[PDB]
């Protein structure tokens, strides 16, 4: 627990310190990619991947789910 909360605190540090201009982009990206549609995306030939800013580090996952 002591070791895990150390890497848990990094996301809170990188989140509470975000600037307002970054927060606008973050909220826009979060709302834009809230839900997906395989049908229309496949029809257009494109795949909508989550942006890198919207990826939590694997060390705070329930035990590691990179996929």
């Amino acid at each position: 627990s002591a070791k895990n909360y150390i890497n848990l605190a990094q996301i809170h540090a990188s989140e509470n310190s975000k600037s307002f201009e970054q927060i606008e982009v973050e909220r826009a990206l979060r709302k834009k990619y809230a839900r997906k549609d395989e049908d229309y995306d496949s029809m257009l030939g494109i795949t909508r991947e989550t942006p890198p800013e919207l990826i939590l580090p694997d060390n705070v996952l329930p035990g590691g789910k990179p996929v």
Binding site: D37, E38, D39, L44
Partner: protein, 488 residues
């Protein structure tokens, strides 16, 4: 030259706007600059604006739209009945397309072809009401038929949507073939595809004096095809499955927009092309069967969409009561019933779409809904009572005047069967009521709040339903004028 098209602007404009929307969507759905934007809500709002503009064009052309009536005679004949029927169908289409906007972004269904197909099927329906010939009748039927065959199977992930779309396709193709075979012999035995000259060669001699085996059986096949089109018992082979499998906004557009146009079409055919009084019998038994079987079958259903399907079948029987009694009051009751049923169906499907945000499937999921959202519970209970025919609401007036029309023609058996089917019909409606007010299940399903357009439409319809009996004169006067305009 150009002024001869003043009678087709409410349709030319909608076609041009449909083309513009299709072009805009296809151009800007594949642009790499904007990264393939989800422009389904944008196209939907533009389509709603286009529908409003063509409604404004249609409403302000009442003195117009009857000019150059000789030039357009072979193609279509629009009059006061057609004017009001179109002005109501277009409003119903606008409401349906307006209450489905959240469906596009809540479950991420950004296919703008849905909206353009709604618009183009609406154009086909506008053709159907004005249609005054067998050829135009069939072509306008086929426009909406193909649009709905495409739309029903739009959601290509669920086995229900695809199978329901295929069943709708097969049933509609068979019905269209039956209707077209019926029209072929009526053309063969008399010529005169035009309705004006079809109503003049058949009025000369009654079917009782001498028997023509061609005209009678062609009329019978046309009636059978039309009853397939409106899914009237016993010609209800797959309608509940169609309504259950098809996406919720599609079913919302169905059973309101198609039925109005098809009923206007049946009115035009019945009044003119039927003088042997042989369609009274085919409407009589089929409407009775629809009443009885809808009432006896909707009580055994546990899902919501199936219940709405069987309620629609029952109300189709109630409306078809008006065909059997051919008088001014019969047609008036029929049209009033269609109007009230359309409003109540819009309200009920707004309710269903509201709870679709959390994937409501059965009737037990809406348990203890009076606690989480009491006001929506009250609205749903009021709409359900309006379906039931309880006096202090709209829907009771339609059933009332339908019964009055049935008793006017001396069809005393129609009144009795209507009463008994209403008695059983109210029972399972109140059964829906008990699970939604009184008994509280252990597990509660929480529904996220609604959006403004659905809420506004729902509030307007709810205030219309409750307060209709206070001031019902305008609807009655519209309907009396429409019934008489079939002849003068």
């Amino acid at each position: 030259m150009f002024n001869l098209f003043l009678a087709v602007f409410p349709e030319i404009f909608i076609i041009n706007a449909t083309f513009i929307l299709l072009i805009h969507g296809v151009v800007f759905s594949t642009s790499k600059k904007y990264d393939y934007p989800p422009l389904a809500s944008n196209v939907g709002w533009l389509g709603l604006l286009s529908v409003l503009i063509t409604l404004l064009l249609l409403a302000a052309g009442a003195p117009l739209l009857t000019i150059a009536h000789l030039f357009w005679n072979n193609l279509f004949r629009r009059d006061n009945f057609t004017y009001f029927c179109q002005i109501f169908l277009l409003l119903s289409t606008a409401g349906t397309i307006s209450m489905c906007f959240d469906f596009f972004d809540q479950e991420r269904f950004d296919a703008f072809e849905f909206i353009v197909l709604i618009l183009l099927s609406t154009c086909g329906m506008l053709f159907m009401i004005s249609a005054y010939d067998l050829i135009a009748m069939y072509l306008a039927i086929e426009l909406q038929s193909l649009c709905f065959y495409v739309i029903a199977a739009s959601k290509r992930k669920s086995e229900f949507s695809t199978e329901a779309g295929l069943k709708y396709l097969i049933l509609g193709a068979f019905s269209s073939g039956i209707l077209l075979f019926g029209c072929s012999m009526i053309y063969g035995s008399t010529g005169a595809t035009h309705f004006d000259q079809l109503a003049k060669i058949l009025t000369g001699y009654e079917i009782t004096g001498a028997r023509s085996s061609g005209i009678f059986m062609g009329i019978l096949f046309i009636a059978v095809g039309f009853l397939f089109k409106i899914t009237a018992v016993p010609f209800h082979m797959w309608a509940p499955d169609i309504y259950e499998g098809s996406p919720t906004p599609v079913t919302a557009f169905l059973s309101i927009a198609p039925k109005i146009s098809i009923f206007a079409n049946i009115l035009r055919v019945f009044i003119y092309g039927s003088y042997g009084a042989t369609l009274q019998q085919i409407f009589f038994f089929c409407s009775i069967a629809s009443m009885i079987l809808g009432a006896l079958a909707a009580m055994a259903q546990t899902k919501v969409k199936r219940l709405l399907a069987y309620s629609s079948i029952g109300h189709v029987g109630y409306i078809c009561i008006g065909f059997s009694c051919g008088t001014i009051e019969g047609i008036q009751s029929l049209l009033i019933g269609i109007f009230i049923y359309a409003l109540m169906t819009m309200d009920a499907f707004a309710i269903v779409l509201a709870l679709r945000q959390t994937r409501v499937k059965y009737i037990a999921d809406l348990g203890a809904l009076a606690k989480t959202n009491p006001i929506l519970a009250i609205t749903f209970s009021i709409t359900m009572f309006s379906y039931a025919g309880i006096p202090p609401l709209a829907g009771f007036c339609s059933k009332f005047y339908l019964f009055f029309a049935a008793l006017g023609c001396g069809a005393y058996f129609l009144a009795l069967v209507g009463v008994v089917t209403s008695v059983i019909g109210c029972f399972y409606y109140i059964r829906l009521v008990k699970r939604m007010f009184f008994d509280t299940p252990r597990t509660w399903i929480l529904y996220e709040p609604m959006d403004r357009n659905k809420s506004l439409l729902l509030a307007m319809t709810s205030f219309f339903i409750t307060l209709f009996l206070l001031y019902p004169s305008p609807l009655f006067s519209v309907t009396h004028q429409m019934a008489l305009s079939l002849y003068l």
